[PDB]
Every structure is written in C-alpha cells, then in structure tokens.
Design an enzyme around this catalytic site. Structure first.
Site, mmCIF file in Angstrom:
data_model
loop_
_atom_site.group_PDB
_atom_site.id
_atom_site.type_symbol
_atom_site.label_atom_id
_atom_site.label_comp_id
_atom_site.label_asym_id
_atom_site.label_seq_id
_atom_site.Cartn_x
_atom_site.Cartn_y
_atom_site.Cartn_z
ATOM 1 N N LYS A 95 35.460 23.676 37.207
ATOM 2 C CA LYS A 95 36.243 24.329 35.947
ATOM 3 C C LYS A 95 37.467 23.908 34.975
ATOM 4 C CE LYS A 95 36.988 27.663 38.633
ATOM 5 N NZ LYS A 95 36.547 26.203 39.973
ATOM 6 N N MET A 104 39.387 37.002 50.416
ATOM 7 C CA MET A 104 39.006 38.179 50.347
ATOM 8 C C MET A 104 37.960 38.845 51.567
ATOM 9 S SD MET A 104 40.052 39.310 47.825
ATOM 10 C CE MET A 104 41.781 38.325 48.139
ATOM 11 N N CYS A 152 41.364 43.023 45.046
ATOM 12 C CA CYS A 152 41.658 41.973 45.455
ATOM 13 C C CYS A 152 42.942 41.486 46.528
ATOM 14 C CB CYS A 152 42.010 40.794 44.281
ATOM 15 S SG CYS A 152 41.436 39.094 44.753
ATOM 16 N N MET A 153 43.998 42.065 45.846
ATOM 17 C CA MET A 153 45.073 41.703 46.757
ATOM 18 C C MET A 153 45.910 42.892 46.786
ATOM 19 S SD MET A 153 45.104 37.914 46.587
ATOM 20 C CE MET A 153 46.169 38.190 47.503
ATOM 21 N N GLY A 181 44.084 35.254 44.115
ATOM 22 C CA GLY A 181 42.709 34.824 43.480
ATOM 23 C C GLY A 181 42.353 34.812 42.230
ATOM 24 N N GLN A 182 43.109 35.618 41.176
ATOM 25 C CA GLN A 182 43.528 35.298 39.843
ATOM 26 C C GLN A 182 44.575 34.627 39.508
ATOM 27 O OE1 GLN A 182 42.665 39.987 39.425
ATOM 28 N NE2 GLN A 182 41.565 39.332 37.562
HETATM 29 N N1 LIG Z 1 34.452 28.784 41.689
HETATM 30 C C1 LIG Z 1 35.807 29.805 41.573
HETATM 31 N N2 LIG Z 1 36.863 30.302 42.542
HETATM 32 C C2 LIG Z 1 37.832 30.673 42.107
HETATM 33 C C3 LIG Z 1 37.176 32.543 41.977
HETATM 34 C C4 LIG Z 1 35.666 32.410 40.828
HETATM 35 O O1 LIG Z 1 35.258 33.752 40.786
HETATM 36 N N3 LIG Z 1 35.609 31.168 41.358
HETATM 37 N N4 LIG Z 1 37.951 33.938 41.702
HETATM 38 C C5 LIG Z 1 39.427 33.435 42.038
HETATM 39 C C6 LIG Z 1 39.371 35.240 42.855
HETATM 40 S S1 LIG Z 1 40.059 36.217 42.197
HETATM 41 C C7 LIG Z 1 39.276 35.318 44.495
HETATM 42 S S2 LIG Z 1 39.985 37.061 45.148
HETATM 43 C C8 LIG Z 1 38.363 33.586 45.140
HETATM 44 C C9 LIG Z 1 38.210 34.284 46.180
HETATM 45 O O2 LIG Z 1 38.286 32.986 47.189
HETATM 46 P P1 LIG Z 1 37.558 33.376 48.737
HETATM 47 O O3 LIG Z 1 37.306 34.900 49.338
HETATM 48 O O4 LIG Z 1 37.844 32.213 49.348
HETATM 49 O O5 LIG Z 1 35.175 33.505 47.753
HETATM 50 P P2 LIG Z 1 34.093 34.687 48.126
HETATM 51 O O6 LIG Z 1 33.407 34.118 47.767
HETATM 52 O O7 LIG Z 1 34.808 35.435 47.092
HETATM 53 O O8 LIG Z 1 34.137 35.263 49.488
HETATM 54 C C10 LIG Z 1 33.347 34.220 50.833
HETATM 55 C C11 LIG Z 1 33.929 34.760 51.772
HETATM 56 O O9 LIG Z 1 34.194 35.326 52.210
HETATM 57 C C12 LIG Z 1 34.532 35.842 54.259
HETATM 58 N N5 LIG Z 1 33.624 37.027 55.102
HETATM 59 C C13 LIG Z 1 33.097 37.627 54.328
HETATM 60 N N6 LIG Z 1 32.920 38.832 55.663
HETATM 61 C C14 LIG Z 1 34.018 38.975 56.304
HETATM 62 C C15 LIG Z 1 34.625 39.840 56.815
HETATM 63 O O10 LIG Z 1 34.420 39.642 57.688
HETATM 64 N N7 LIG Z 1 36.096 38.929 57.749
HETATM 65 C C16 LIG Z 1 36.602 37.355 56.868
HETATM 66 N N8 LIG Z 1 37.631 37.195 57.618
HETATM 67 N N9 LIG Z 1 36.013 36.754 56.338
HETATM 68 C C17 LIG Z 1 34.454 37.730 55.819
HETATM 69 C C18 LIG Z 1 33.328 34.857 54.308
HETATM 70 O O11 LIG Z 1 33.251 34.104 54.836
HETATM 71 C C19 LIG Z 1 32.926 33.864 53.075
HETATM 72 O O12 LIG Z 1 33.928 32.309 53.051
HETATM 73 O O13 LIG Z 1 38.475 33.098 44.569
HETATM 74 C C20 LIG Z 1 39.348 32.894 43.177
HETATM 75 N N10 LIG Z 1 39.394 31.629 43.027
HETATM 76 N N1 LIG Z 2 30.206 41.555 44.371
HETATM 77 C C1 LIG Z 2 31.863 41.642 44.390
HETATM 78 N N2 LIG Z 2 32.314 42.127 43.682
HETATM 79 C C2 LIG Z 2 33.482 41.624 43.189
HETATM 80 C C3 LIG Z 2 34.349 40.404 43.875
HETATM 81 C C4 LIG Z 2 32.933 40.425 44.561
HETATM 82 O O1 LIG Z 2 33.594 39.082 45.833
HETATM 83 N N3 LIG Z 2 31.610 41.059 45.058
HETATM 84 N N4 LIG Z 2 35.146 39.814 43.672
HETATM 85 C C5 LIG Z 2 36.164 41.313 43.100
HETATM 86 C C6 LIG Z 2 37.506 40.184 42.964
HETATM 87 S S1 LIG Z 2 38.411 40.215 44.447
HETATM 88 C C7 LIG Z 2 37.632 40.431 41.533
HETATM 89 S S2 LIG Z 2 39.614 39.140 41.477
HETATM 90 C C8 LIG Z 2 37.572 40.836 40.177
HETATM 91 C C9 LIG Z 2 36.864 40.503 39.018
HETATM 92 O O2 LIG Z 2 36.213 40.960 38.497
HETATM 93 P P1 LIG Z 2 36.622 40.355 36.162
HETATM 94 O O3 LIG Z 2 37.994 40.808 36.238
HETATM 95 O O4 LIG Z 2 36.134 41.962 36.198
HETATM 96 O O5 LIG Z 2 35.824 39.327 36.248
HETATM 97 P P2 LIG Z 2 36.252 38.532 34.801
HETATM 98 O O6 LIG Z 2 34.671 37.511 34.585
HETATM 99 O O7 LIG Z 2 37.323 37.535 35.820
HETATM 100 O O8 LIG Z 2 36.868 39.380 33.728
HETATM 101 C C10 LIG Z 2 37.896 38.683 32.908
HETATM 102 C C11 LIG Z 2 37.103 39.104 31.302
HETATM 103 O O9 LIG Z 2 37.803 39.480 30.579
HETATM 104 C C12 LIG Z 2 37.291 38.512 29.147
HETATM 105 N N5 LIG Z 2 38.379 37.641 28.563
HETATM 106 C C13 LIG Z 2 38.572 36.139 29.012
HETATM 107 N N6 LIG Z 2 39.849 35.999 27.800
HETATM 108 C C14 LIG Z 2 40.311 37.295 27.448
HETATM 109 C C15 LIG Z 2 41.997 38.331 26.918
HETATM 110 O O10 LIG Z 2 42.373 36.761 26.820
HETATM 111 N N7 LIG Z 2 41.744 38.892 26.614
HETATM 112 C C16 LIG Z 2 40.313 39.866 26.317
HETATM 113 N N8 LIG Z 2 40.351 41.502 25.778
HETATM 114 N N9 LIG Z 2 39.256 39.841 27.615
HETATM 115 C C17 LIG Z 2 39.389 38.122 27.667
HETATM 116 C C18 LIG Z 2 36.507 37.574 29.469
HETATM 117 O O11 LIG Z 2 34.846 37.808 28.842
HETATM 118 C C19 LIG Z 2 35.468 38.530 31.150
HETATM 119 O O12 LIG Z 2 35.211 39.650 30.442
HETATM 120 O O13 LIG Z 2 35.471 40.851 41.117
HETATM 121 C C20 LIG Z 2 35.610 42.277 42.451
HETATM 122 N N10 LIG Z 2 34.370 42.515 41.884
HETATM 123 S S1 SF4 Z 3 43.510 26.189 38.774
HETATM 124 FE FE1 SF4 Z 3 41.610 25.783 39.833
HETATM 125 S S2 SF4 Z 3 39.833 26.714 38.348
HETATM 126 FE FE2 SF4 Z 3 41.218 25.537 37.951
HETATM 127 S S3 SF4 Z 3 41.767 23.536 38.163
HETATM 128 FE FE3 SF4 Z 3 42.820 23.893 39.520
HETATM 129 S S4 SF4 Z 3 41.565 24.675 41.552
HETATM 130 FE FE4 SF4 Z 3 40.220 24.238 39.288
#
Ligand SMILES: Nc1nc2c(c(=O)[nH]1)N[C@H]1C(S)=C(S)[C@@H](COP(=O)(O)OP(=O)(O)OC[C@H]3O[C@@H](n4cnc5c(=O)[nH]c(N)nc54)[C@H](O)[C@@H]3O)O[C@H]1N2
Ligand SMILES: Nc1nc2c(c(=O)[nH]1)N[C@H]1C(S)=C(S)[C@@H](COP(=O)(O)OP(=O)(O)OC[C@H]3O[C@@H](n4cnc5c(=O)[nH]c(N)nc54)[C@H](O)[C@@H]3O)O[C@H]1N2
Ligand code: SF4
Ligand code: HEC
Ligand code: HEC
Ligand code: MOS
Lengths: 799, 109
Positions: free
Chosen positions: A53, A343, A149-150, A380-381
């Site tokens: 990415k 998460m 998220c957090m 995460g973010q």
């Molecule tokens: N490539 C990629 N990287 C990202 C992001 C992205 O969108 N893409 N988003 C960023 C953000 S904002 C976030 S919050 C992180 C999320 O990063 P992670 O939380 O690592 O990833 P997810 O795919 O959301 O969650 C899947 C995990 O949930 C765990 N899980 C599900 N149920 C349970 C349970 O009951 N207990 C426990 N302990 N674990 C459980 C599973 O084992 C699995 O490994 O990634 C960040 N980095």
């Molecule tokens: N089912 C399920 N749902 C989840 C999760 C999950 O694991 N499972 N994870 C949860 C978590 S941990 C998180 S962090 C949330 C993340 O969920 P979101 O934050 O809603 O998802 P993003 O796609 O990161 O949204 C960012 C947006 O910003 C826009 N954009 C990019 N740059 C800019 C800018 O500078 N300004 C503006 N105005 N827009 C911009 C992008 O086009 C995109 O639409 O999702 C949550 N939702």
């Molecule tokens: S900050 Fe995260 S998404 Fe960006 S290059 Fe590093 S590991 Fe990849």
C-alpha cells in the site's frame, strides 16, 4: 530528503497515508504531480521499507472520479432531499448548510447537530472541528470513526493507568523474547511492525512468536505456537494466565506491592444495544457499566482461580498444553514479553475488560515500561492517536485525556479557548453508534461527515445508518475526495483536498507525531477539510449559537462570528504569513491570511505541555521524521512511567503510574461473559469481518489504484473446505451471507490466505459492492461504546 | 449526478450479483508478480519464492540481502523474507476506473 541541485524531482518527507505503523515516506513531485514515493531511509519506524500500500501512494490521489465541485441534491432549482445531485458553488453549498444548521439550532438546539470525524484528519483538522462543535455550536455530538476502533483501548488505559496511549514504543520489537499476538493480524495490518517482529525472531531464534486468532492467517507462517480459539473466549484465556502466574508463585511481589492496587468490576452489563432490546432489559448493570470496587490480592487470586485448565480448555477449544506454554512465557521472570492486540480485543462486547485483563498479566509480573516488556495496544488509523484521541474528537472528551463531565477540565478548556464559564456542554453527546440511532429517530438533524465512509463502515446498515441518512427530517453533508456509498446517501457532497494536497500532521501508534508540507495542489475546486471547517465558522454570529446569559459573561464577543472567537482569537492567528516556508504552498494560510496550522497546533499544545502530553515546538516537527511525546526540553520519551526514561517520574520510585493519584496501576477481576449474538440452529456460523493487506478500509482509495484493485478485486467469503462441501459449495460459487439484520452476496474462497475453523467464516469489508455491514450487529462494549464487528451469527445460503 | 464505480449501479439497499473470481494473470515500485502464487509455501520453515529467486527467474536484487544497517548478508534479510507484503500478483481483469497517475519516466520526457 536530498541536498542535490540537479534532481528534476522535488522530494519531501511525509508519513504514510495508511496504517498506524506510521512509516515515513519521501514523495517526489514535478509539474503538480506525485510521480513516486519511497520508504524514507531516515525514518526510524521503517528505515526505508514500505508494504505494498505505501509503495502505491503515488496513485491514491489520481482516481479519474476525484470530486472537484460541491454537489447538492436539487429539484426545480432548490435544495430537495429527493433530488439528484447537481454541481453548485462553494458559496451556494455553504449558504444551504448555513440555512439547514441554523434552522435546526433554532428549533431543536445543539443536541440536534453533529459531526462524524476521523483518525485520518490531520491534528489541526481535528482540533479545529472539536472547537467548532464543543465551543462554537456547544454540541458534544462529535465523534470519530476511531470510536469503532480504539475506544476500548482508551477506556482500558484510563481505567488501568489513568492516562491514554502505550507506555512502550517500537524499540520494544528489538528487545522482546516473546511476542504474543492476541488476535492482531500484523502480517497484513501492521506489515512493517511484523517485519520488525520477523527480524527479531529469525535473527534471535530463541525468541518465541505466539499467535492467537479465531482463524488461521499469514501471521501463522512465523508462529512457534499457533492457537485458534472460540470467539470471545480470550477473556477466559487471559484469566487462566493470571491464575497460572499465581498458582506457580510467579507474582512479582515487589512490583505488585509498590505499584499496583486491585479492583473487581461490575458484571452483567448488557451489550450497548437500544434500551428496548431484550439483552438490555435483561442486564442488571447496564446503567453504570464501568463501576468497580477495591479488593485485595487474595480476592483477586480467588476470583481468577475459577478459570482453571478444565473450564478454559473446554470453553475456548484450546488444548491445555498450549494454554500452559503460553502462560509460562508470561510467568517466567527472565522472558521479556511484548503482548500485541488490535481489533480482536477492541471490537469486542467486553473489549474494555480484555484490555484491562492483558494489562493484568504484565502488572502481576512487573513486565512493563522497560525495553521488550511491553503490553502494546496497536492503533489502526494513521492518526487515531495523534488526532482523535490526543485532541479528544469524541462525544465525552476534551484535549489531553480530559472529559466534558469534569468541571475543572471544562474550566481549563474554557481558559485556553477564552470562553465564558459554562460554554462547554457538561454532558457527553452522541457517540458513533448512538449517532446512527439518533439519525434514524429524527433527533440528529444537521450532520457533517469528514474523512470517513461510515455508511460502509458502521454496523447494521439496513436498520440504522441507511434509514437514518435518508430520513427526510435530516440534512447530511459529506466531505470526501471520492464518490463513496456514504456520499451517495448524503444530501450535499463537498470535494476535499487529501494527504499531500495540504499541510498535515499525523500521530502514530508509538506517540510519534509526524508532519508534512503541502506538496501539490488539489484538482478542480477541492479544498481541505481544514479550510471548510474554518470557512463555515464565518457564517455564525455568537448570538445565533450561544445563549444570552453566556454572552453576558464575555460581552466583548457581541456581534462576532465563530471564526473570530475560535480562529482569529489572538492565539490561533498569532503567527503571520512571513512564518510560512515559501518553498511550499499553503492554501489555507493564503485563504485566511495567517499561519493557521501553526496557530492551531500551538494553541492545542498548551493543553499537554507541562501536563504529561508535551508536544515539541511546531517547527521541530517540520525538521524531524517525527518525535515521540512527551517531548521535554527537546528530548522525546520512549518508555513512559519508568524512572530514568520518563522525566515526569519521581526519583527513587522505579515506576510511577502518575495518571493515577496514588501513582499505582490497577489490576481488575473481570469475568468471561458471552458475545451479544452467538451461532444457533437458525444461524449456525460465526461471521468475522476485517481487512486484507492490499486494501484500506472501504477501498475508496486502494481499489482505485490499478495494482491494488487487480491484487484483490472483490471481497470473498473465506470458508473451511468441509463446510463448503456440506453446503454443496465449490470455490468460486456465489452465496448469500444472511443474519437477522441483512444480507450480502459474495463468492466462496476455500483455499485463500485466511483459513477458518469449521463453523466460522471471514469476510473482508473493503468492497463497496459487497456491503458486509448490512449483516453485522451494532452491539458494543457498554463501557467504551465500541462496536463488535468480529462476531455475530449468520446463515450461508447457496444463491 | 453521482455514482460510485467501486460499487456499480446497484442501489445501496439491494445486493448485486458478485463478479466471477478472476484467475491470476500469467504475463521505484516493487514489480508485481506476473505469475500465480497459490501453490507456493511462504513460511519460516520454507520460502518457496527463494527456490527460483535466490541470488545463488530474475534473482532478488542485493537490497533484499541487506539488514536494517545496510550490511549485505549471505542470505535474504528477514526484513524481506515475507515477499508478499510487497509483491502481489494481478487478476486477469481491467481496473474499475481510470487512474491519472504519471510515472517518473513519463513526467521526465
Ligand atoms: N492492510 C490494511 N491494514 C490496516 C487497515 C486496513 O484497512 N488495511 N486498517 C488499520 C486499522 S484502522 C485497524 S483498526 C487495524 C485492524 O487490524 P487487525 O485487528 O489486525 O485486523 P482485522 O482484519 O480488522 O481483524 C481480524 C482479526 O480479529 C481477530 N479476532 C476476531 N475475533 C476475536 C476474538 O474474539 N478475540 C480476539 N482476541 N481476536 C479476535 C482475528 O483473530 C483476526 O486476526 O488495521 C490497520 N491497518
Ligand atoms: N465490518 C467491519 N466494519 C468496520 C471494521 C471492521 O473490522 N469490520 N473496522 C472499523 C474500524 S477499526 C475503522 S478505523 C473504521 C474505518 O472506516 P472509515 O474511516 O469510514 O473508512 P475509510 O475508507 O478509511 O474512510 C476514509 C474516507 O476518507 C476519504 N478521503 C481520503 N482522504 C480525504 C481527505 O483528506 N478528506 C476527506 N474529506 N476525505 C478523504 C476516503 O475517500 C474515504 O471515503 O471502519 C470500521 N468498520
Ligand atoms: S504505514 Fe502501514 S500501510 Fe503505510 S507503508 Fe507502513 S506498514 Fe504499509
Ligand atoms: C519458479 C518455479 C518460481 C517460483 C517458485 C517463484 N517465481 Fe517469481 N518468477 C518466476 C519467473 C520464471 C518469472 C518471470 C521472469 C522474471 O523474473 O520476470 C518470475 C517473476 C517474478 C517477479 C517479477 C520480477 C521482475 O521481472 O521484475 C516477481 C516480483 C516474482 N516473480 C515474485 C515471486 C514471489 C514473491 C514468489 C513466491 C510467492 C515467486 N515469485 C515464486 C519464477 C518463479
Ligand atoms: C518490500 C519491503 C519488499 C519485500 C518484502 C520484498 N521485495 Fe522484492 N522488491 C521490492 C522493491 C521495492 C523492488 C524494486 C527495487 C529493487 O530492489 O530492485 C524489488 C525488486 C524485486 C525483484 C526485481 C529485482 C530486479 O533485479 O529488478 C524481484 C525478482 C523481487 N523483488 C523478488 C522478491 C522476493 C522473491 C521476495 C521475498 C524473498 C521479495 N522480493 C521481498 C520490495 C520488496
Ligand atoms: Mo481502526 S482506528
């Protein structure tokens, strides 16, 4: 970046736009185009590496459908909720937002306006928005995507330590002897931190890597011990290890006696559902769900003694031998342990308790705040820490850990913001889940979303979000860089400048705040979220938004606008245009006529300086590749709460958890309690949701990059091969995934990177054509209000 | 007057038919992988990529044998061991929307 006078490219530093790792990149520009990015060799986080990415950052701003003009629903020449979108000018968009917000403020008041913001806002965007709502409209209805998220991590920190964010740092990855991943999928979700775990493990092979998950994924390709456990049974496993430590006489007596106290929390606290849901009617303690009483060590030991090997192994499905291998790493005083979670612990209907319970393990053994001994919550973010949590863009918060319910905290914010006493609302507003419920119910009527795609991201789309956004009582404004499903469900769409089209700051998972300059200009009439918040504030006089008895306290504000009060206040405007570095554009400083970002940051930094959250002088961050707070006398802090590393810790103490008035961290007795919704005979599978390496969140940026889209075009249903056989499915066959709330359609993957146990499927959420949050339940931890997207019950039906 | 090409024409309230699962194409940035990788083990006991791409298929470049201090080592660095964090294969399908990115060679000529 480079000293050279002969490059035709202009290279500048910036943090990555994606995960909370916070890799530094260098960005090459020529003729207003980013033509390349590279991992910054000078950045300490990543030392020149990126994941796929970060390597395609040069493409994320250039989707052919970038938004370039404000778009407003119109019919017969005027705003209409039922009209299709038409291009309007910025002045027309703001004229309409002005009429709508004013109508709602007058008829319903500030509890009926709101904002849904972002951990992808820049620090100064978050701070400007928090000011506009909490001090301007006097509404605490500002919450961010980072509530999803957090918030369980933040609630866990405030309860155990009285202060947010980790006390270790990434240097711990080079010092740990065991890494314990509590459901984190670091390989895909924090790839460069997984590189640092991989270097430590492969270069120092006595190191152990233990990965716990509810399905098998790529972290298992490094794991010494892999544990697949039943969803939510991690609570029992965490108590099993506490019990093992005690049973084997491995409590660090000195540390526990000097530096900890014990509490027992209230139980049977519901599931954060609507008050008329049967789970809420049944719960005894939903109305004060974080309540706790002081107990002794002996009561704690009796409490966790119920989590014995027979009970935990049977509940979790984990063999006793693996439970013991894992607990032994915690207990052995010569093994430095870094615990990591994301998460799986936070998106959990007892996520705040799980955070407390993993801290218990480190606090019982004194494995904390020293190199390699590190309970490390991953963020995460890119700026859930630097923006949403540190600035406090939440419905209950003020900056620097403060809360609106504390009248001394409101007094400090009023002092720094130069507000009359009583300006800041004293009750928490609507948090994320409650905002969608209040939109549905017609009680939140003027709403502005920035830097998120919450229609795709929030749980229970069909029952709460979608009805709420399309309710004709509501006017929904979305600022985005691209068309999204959230913008399609809106009434007014504002084209926004993103990443290096504006000057920015993000704060990553180890308290590193990283700045960037604006390196290019946005297309069309797109403008920063920062410019929009500040420009909109001009449309409101104090008489329109504050009550008379408030204005009487500060009569010098008669007749002034919120732009004057909040942004041109002698503080936020105190750095003139000459302070702007003339080598880079700064669109907002030009528009408003002073160095807006520097004034916002320095005013914001007054909250944390001298109060444990110290940010360095603004200019230092344009010079450095990030500095980790507290920055005191220009030196960053790596380990907090540890004598000799953290300058706030009293001499002679070893440790001081000074977020708490006695200097002690709290160890909590808390039970296993089951999920809000588990499989049954009608819905016999667990649905787990999450991400894949190559896409970010809702895919609106990564799925517009040719290479990332082609690497993983569509979401899939990851399924055990024998479960597929039993449903008469083959790989590639279409199913519906159906819960009590909604359905989605997707194809089966039985040989992919995520390989779940029988009974459980995993569906990633990045595909806007496959809206999995129609299926999920908006049940939350009752304490942090964070949604559990990781388990609910589904039926899988062959299409 | 607004459509999201990531979703396609289908109303938010309805569910589209899922497109077929496309086969992988056999054909500054990390090159994409011009071949399938589904039968290729990548774990700490065996890195199948290194069977064809080791320095002893074009080989991995020298940067892949460097540690965080840029010392060149006799074998692939742990920091590049998990190749698929950076190199991805590509589905045999067209992108959903155009992208106006311009590369270094193009911007310079
Ligand atoms: N490539 C990629 N990287 C990202 C992001 C992205 O969108 N893409 N988003 C960023 C953000 S904002 C976030 S919050 C992180 C999320 O990063 P992670 O939380 O690592 O990833 P997810 O795919 O959301 O969650 C899947 C995990 O949930 C765990 N899980 C599900 N149920 C349970 C349970 O009951 N207990 C426990 N302990 N674990 C459980 C599973 O084992 C699995 O490994 O990634 C960040 N980095
Ligand atoms: N089912 C399920 N749902 C989840 C999760 C999950 O694991 N499972 N994870 C949860 C978590 S941990 C998180 S962090 C949330 C993340 O969920 P979101 O934050 O809603 O998802 P993003 O796609 O990161 O949204 C960012 C947006 O910003 C826009 N954009 C990019 N740059 C800019 C800018 O500078 N300004 C503006 N105005 N827009 C911009 C992008 O086009 C995109 O639409 O999702 C949550 N939702
Ligand atoms: S900050 Fe995260 S998404 Fe960006 S290059 Fe590093 S590991 Fe990849
Ligand atoms: C032989 C049986 C191989 C195995 C196992 C792997 N790869 Fe491969 N790769 C192979 C060939 C014959 C080719 C085309 C020649 C070439 O080098 O281009 C490739 C190509 C790649 C590339 C592109 C390199 C470039 O041209 O710049 C990459 C990035 C790549 N292969 C990566 C890769 C990965 C990560 C592997 C394990 C998952 C893998 N290859 C295995 C031959 C073989
Ligand atoms: C990111 C941290 C990477 C990891 C992990 C791997 N590679 Fe890589 N590779 C990466 C970059 C940025 C580049 C282009 C710059 C360069 O170093 O040459 C490459 C290049 C290749 C190549 C082409 C080599 C050439 O001579 O042109 C190949 C064949 C290759 N990479 C393969 C490969 C393998 C097999 C990996 C795991 C052992 C591996 N790479 C990991 C970035 C990253
Ligand atoms: Mo996910 S912040």
């Amino acid at each position: 970046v480079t000293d050279s006078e002969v490059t035709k490219l202009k290279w500048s530093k910036a943090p990555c736009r994606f995960c909370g790792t916070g890799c530094g990149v260098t960005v090459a520009v020529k003729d207003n185009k980013v033509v390349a990015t590279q991992g910054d060799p000078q950045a300490e986080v990543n030392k020149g590496l990126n994941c796929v990415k970060g390597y395609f950052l040069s493409k994320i701003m250039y989707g052919q459908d970038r938004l370039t003009r404000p778009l407003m629903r119109m019919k017969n020449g005027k705003y209409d909720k039922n009209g299709d979108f038409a291009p309007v000018t910025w002045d027309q968009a703001f004229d309409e937002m002005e009429r709508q917000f004013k109508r709602v403020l007058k008829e319903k008041g500030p509890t009926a306006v709101g904002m849904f913001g972002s951990g992808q806002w820049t620090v100064w965007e978050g701070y400007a928005a928090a000011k506009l709502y909490k001090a301007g409209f006097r509404s605490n209805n500002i919450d961010p995507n980072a509530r999803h998220c957090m918030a369980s991590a933040a609630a866990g920190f405030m309860r155990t330590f009285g202060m947010d964010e980790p006390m270790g740092c990434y240097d711990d990855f080079e010092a740990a002897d065991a890494f314990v991943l509590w459901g984190s999928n670091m390989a895909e979700m924090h790839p460069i931190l997984w590189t640092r775990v991989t270097d430590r493990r492969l270069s120092h092979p006595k190191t152990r890597v233990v990965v716990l998950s509810t399905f098998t994924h790529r972290c298992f390709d490094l794991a010494d011990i892999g544990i697949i456990f039943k969803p939510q049974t991690d609570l029992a496993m965490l108590n099993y290890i506490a019990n093992y430590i005690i049973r084997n006489n491995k409590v660090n007596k000195d540390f526990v006696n000097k530096h900890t106290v014990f509490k027992e929390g209230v139980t049977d606290i519901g599931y954060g559902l609507r008050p008329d849901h049967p789970l809420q009617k049944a719960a005894k303690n939903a109305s004060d769900p974080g309540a706790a009483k002081v107990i002794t060590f002996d009561e704690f030991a009796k409490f966790v003694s119920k989590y014995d090997a027979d009970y935990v192994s049977k509940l979790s499905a984990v063999p006793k031998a693996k439970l013991d291998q894992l607990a032994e790493l915690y207990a052995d005083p010569n093994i430095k342990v870094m615990s990591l979670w994301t998460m799986g612990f936070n998106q959990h209907t007892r996520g705040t308790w799980a955070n407390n319970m993993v801290y218990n393990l480190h606090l019982l053994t004194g494995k904390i705040a020293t190199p390699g001994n590190s309970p490390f919550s991953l963020t995460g973010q890119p700026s859930a820490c630097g923006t949403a949590r540190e600035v406090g863009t939440f419905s209950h918060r003020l900056p620097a850990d403060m809360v609106v319910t504390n009248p001394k905290h409101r007094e400090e914010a009023e002092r720094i913001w130069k507000l009359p006493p009583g300006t800041i609302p004293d009750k928490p507003g609507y948090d994320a889940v409650l905002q969608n419920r209040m939109l549905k119910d017609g009680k939140l009527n003027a709403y502005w979303v920035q830097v998120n795609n919450n229609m795709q991201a929030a749980a229970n789309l069909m029952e709460e979000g979608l009805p709420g956004y399309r309710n004709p009582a509501n006017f929904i404004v979305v600022s985005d860089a691209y068309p999204t499903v959230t913008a399609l469900a809106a009434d007014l769409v504002l084209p926004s400048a993103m990443w290096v089209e504006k000057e920015g700051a993000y704060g990553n998972a180890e308290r590193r705040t990283q700045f960037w300059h604006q390196l290019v200009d946005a297309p069309g009439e797109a403008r920063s979220d920062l410019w929009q918040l500040v420009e909109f504030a001009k449309r409101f006089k104090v008489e329109e938004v504050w009550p008379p008895e408030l204005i009487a306290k500060k009569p010098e504000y008669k007749g002034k606008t919120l732009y004057d009060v909040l942004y041109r206040n002698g503080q936020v405007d105190k750095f003139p245009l000459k302070d702007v570095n003339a080598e880079y554009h700064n669109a907002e400083a030009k528009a408003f006529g002073f160095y807006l970002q520097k004034g916002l940051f320095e005013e914001y930094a007054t909250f944390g300086r001298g109060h444990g959250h110290d940010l360095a002088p603004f200019d230092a961050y344009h010079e450095a590749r990030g500095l980790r707070w507290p920055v005191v006398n220009g030196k960053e802090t790596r380990w907090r709460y540890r004598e000799g590393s953290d300058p706030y810790v009293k001499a002679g103490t070893g440790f001081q958890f000074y977020g708490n008035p006695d200097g002690k961290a709290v160890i909590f007795a808390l039970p296993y309690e089951p999920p809000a919704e588990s499989p049954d005979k009608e819905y016999p599978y667990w649905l787990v949701t999450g991400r894949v390496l190559e896409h970010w969140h809702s895919g609106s940026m990564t799925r517009r990059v040719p290479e990332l889209y082609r690497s993983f075009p569509n979401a899939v249903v990851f399924m055990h091969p024998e479960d597929a056989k039993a449903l008469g499915l083959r790989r590639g066959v279409e199913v519906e995934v159906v819960s009590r709330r909604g359905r989605m359609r997707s194809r089966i993957e039985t040989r992919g990177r995520d390989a779940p146990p029988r009974g459980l499927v995993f569906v990633p959420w990045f595909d806007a054509s496959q809206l999995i949050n129609k299926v999920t339940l908006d049940a939350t931890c009752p304490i942090s209000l964070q949604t559990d997207f990781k388990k609910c019950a589904v039926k899988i039906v062959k299409v | 007057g607004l459509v999201d090409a990531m979703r396609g024409p289908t109303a938010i309230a309805n569910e589209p038919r899922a497109p077929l699962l496309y086969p992988t194409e056999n054909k500054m940035q990390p090159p994409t992988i011009p071949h399938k990788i589904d039968g290729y083990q990548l774990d700490k006991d065996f890195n199948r990529c290194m069977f064809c791409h080791a320095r002893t298929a074009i080989p991995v470049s020298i940067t892949h044998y460097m540690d965080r201090d840029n010392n060149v080592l006799a074998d692939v660095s742990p920091r590049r061991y998990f190749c698929t964090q950076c190199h991805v294969p590509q589905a045999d399908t067209k992108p959903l929307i155009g992208n106006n990115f311009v590369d270094v060679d193009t911007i310079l000529k």
